[PDB]
UniProtKB/Swiss-Prot annotation, chain A:
Biased composition (Gly residues): 20-30
Organism superkingdom: Bacteria
Family: Belongs to the universal ribosomal protein uL15 family.
Organism: Escherichia coli (strain K12)
Name this polypeptide is given: Large ribosomal subunit protein uL15
Full protein stretch here: 2 to 73 of 144
GO biological process: cytoplasmic translation
Subunit structure as annotated in this protein's UniProt entry: Part of the 50S ribosomal subunit. Contacts the 5S rRNA.
A Gene Ontology cellular-component term: cytoplasm
Organism phylogeny: Bacteria, Pseudomonadati, Pseudomonadota, Gammaproteobacteria, Enterobacterales
A single MF term (Gene Ontology): rRNA binding
Ranges where the record places region Disordered: 1-53
Sorted UniProt keywords: Ribonucleoprotein, Ribosomal protein, RNA-binding, rRNA-binding
Function, as annotated: This protein binds the 5S rRNA. It is required for the late stages of subunit assembly, and is essential for 5S rRNA assembly onto the ribosome.
Curated annotation (Swiss-Prot), chain B:
InterPro entries in UniProt: bL21-like, bL21-like_sf, Ribosomal_bL21, Ribosomal_bL21_CS
Designated name of the protein: Large ribosomal subunit protein bL21
Top-rank taxon: Bacteria
HAMAP family associated with the record: Ribosomal_bL21
CC terms in the record's Gene Ontology section: cytoplasm; cytosol; cytosolic large ribosomal subunit
NCBIfam families on file: L21
Disulfide bonding pattern of the chain: none
GO molecular function, one term: rRNA binding
Family the UniProt entry places it in: Belongs to the bacterial ribosomal protein bL21 family.
Amino acid sequence: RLNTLSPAEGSKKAGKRLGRGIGSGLGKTGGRGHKGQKSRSGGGVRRGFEGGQMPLYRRLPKFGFTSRKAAI
Amino acid sequence: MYAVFQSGGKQHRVSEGQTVRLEKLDIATGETVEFAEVLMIANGEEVKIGVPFVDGGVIKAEVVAHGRGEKVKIVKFRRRKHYRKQQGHRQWFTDVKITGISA
């Protein structure tokens, strides 16, 4: 019977493979569009980057303090 | 000695005792079929249709085969636009032999 067990429907998806033909859908850059920083290998912006504008976590003021008694 | 009749949206001119291929019909391969929609009957003397479909003309035909037509390959290709598509088609057909043509 070892060649009769099957998984539940919807348990597997087979993943996404990029750049494998036209009919496969996401080929020819595999869904990352045309030129640009995001299209490059290893490209992208770090967390909180807004394109040069002051990030939200920098526009706002830090407040409060940590209490050691709260951890005990 | 030939008649004109309308079967599958397209008219056919068939002589006595000849096989004609026409669109698929809901008839088994070993049963006779009737075509009372006779457009024109021709003989030594000529008879036309004052009203369409003559008056009493019928055609007796026997089904022979219910095969599929030759494969046709459909190719859609957009130049430079990263779009190609392939498809195949086999049209169903019915072979029928005309057994008798009335007056």
